[PDB]
Design a protein around this ligand. Structure first.
Ligand SMILES: CC(C)CCC[C@@H](C)[C@H]1CC[C@H]2[C@@H]3CC=C4C[C@@H](OC(=O)CCC(=O)O)CC[C@]4(C)[C@H]3CC[C@]12C
Ligand SMILES: C[N+](C)(C)CC#CCOC1=NOCC1
Length: 285
């Protein structure tokens, strides 16, 4: 606890955090193992879901746990060359999950507008570059900047007892990294799913009850759990100390909720994944 006085009441945030970390690990592992044990699920369509679960597994295991030690124990206790690894891994994995959703939305979009054209040409070797580009671009957007910022301009500038990205102070690279990570994917995903909805209602018109419910549930989950951090980070650059520390931490923690919810909005939609989850959970095999 260190600085966390009155420990009898601060265990609530520790207990809740542990539950949410367990759900993310349990939920995302189920996606991975269901893919392996179910033959019908081993299609090129589910490769993106497997890639999405891999990024969320890293967030649930390392990002959601090492951040908890930073909260209850109100200072970093790992060293300079131990938090740059955490920041690089957490930010790359968080970017990978969002980039995986962007690839998933594109794959879904072309499967609705081109039912007889897209999935035939998009083969296993074509989904590799789709998955590969999501991780490679997520790799070189934060990690070279996070790791080598202290080694490139001046020296280390963050206080020794704390830890953060250390280039968020300048309101130039933070805008470039924010739009390339959140604002651009949000615009594309919203446009693509609105386009998807316009064709689901068109199909039933020629021949919306579940399209409106499902599409609004998946977009709001991404919007709610990612917007507060991307709004406070931009304000933090222009402002100096008007963002409370407690409010900043909640938005930082709210991003990890997307990893918990992702297996529900993308895997549980498929009836084959839903059956396999109950098979493993109830009758352990
Ligand atoms: C950092 C981000 C905000 C800027 C760069 C965005 C790109 C990384 C994303 C957005 C649009 C995505 C593309 C949308 C459409 C396609 C076409 C798609 O190919 C097809 O749909 C044709 C059928 C086939 O797959 O063979 C391959 C993935 C790709 C290049 C996607 C790759 C990843 C892209 C370029
Ligand atoms: C700070 N946290 C790692 C929890 C969130 C993050 C990140 C990486 O960048 C992105 N922000 O919006 C989408 C991806």
């Amino acid at each position: 606890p260190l600085g966390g006085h009155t420990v009898w009441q601060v265990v609530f945030i520790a207990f809740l955090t542990g539950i949410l970390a367990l759900v993310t690990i349990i939920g995302n592992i189920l996606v991975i193992v269901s893919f392996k044990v179910n033959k019908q699920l081993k299609t090129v369509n589910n490769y993106f879901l497997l890639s999405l679960a891999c990024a969320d597994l890293i967030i649930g295991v390392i990002s959601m746990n090492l951040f908890t030690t930073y909260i209850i124990m109100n200072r970093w206790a790992l060293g300079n060359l131990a938090c740059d690894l955490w920041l690089a891994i957490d930010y790359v994995a968080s970017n990978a999950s969002v980039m995986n959703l962007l690839v998933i939305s594109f794959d879904r979009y072309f499967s609705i507008t081109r039912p007889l054209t897209y999935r035939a040409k998009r083969t296993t070797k074509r989904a590799g570059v789709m998955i590969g580009l999501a991780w490679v671009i997520s790799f070189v957007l934060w990690a070279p900047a996070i790791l080598f910022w202290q080694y490139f301009v001046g020296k280390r500038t963050v206080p020794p007892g704390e830890c953060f990205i250390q280039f968020l102070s300048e309101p130039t690279i933070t805008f470039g990294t924010a739009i390339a990570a959140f604002y651009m994917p949000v615009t594309i995903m919203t446009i693509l799913y609105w386009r998807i909805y316009k064709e689901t209602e068109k199909r039933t018109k020629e021949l919306e009850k579940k399209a409106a419910q499902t599409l609004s549930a998946i977009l709001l989950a991404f919007i709610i759990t990612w917007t507060p951090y991307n709004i406070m980070v931009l304000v933090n650059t222009f402002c100096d100390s008007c963002i409370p520390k407690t409010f900043w931490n909640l938005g930082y923690w709210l991003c990890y909720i997307n990893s918990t919810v992702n297996p529900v909005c993308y895997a549980l939609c498929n009836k084959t994944f839903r059956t396999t989850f109950k098979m493993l959970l109830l009758c352990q095999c």
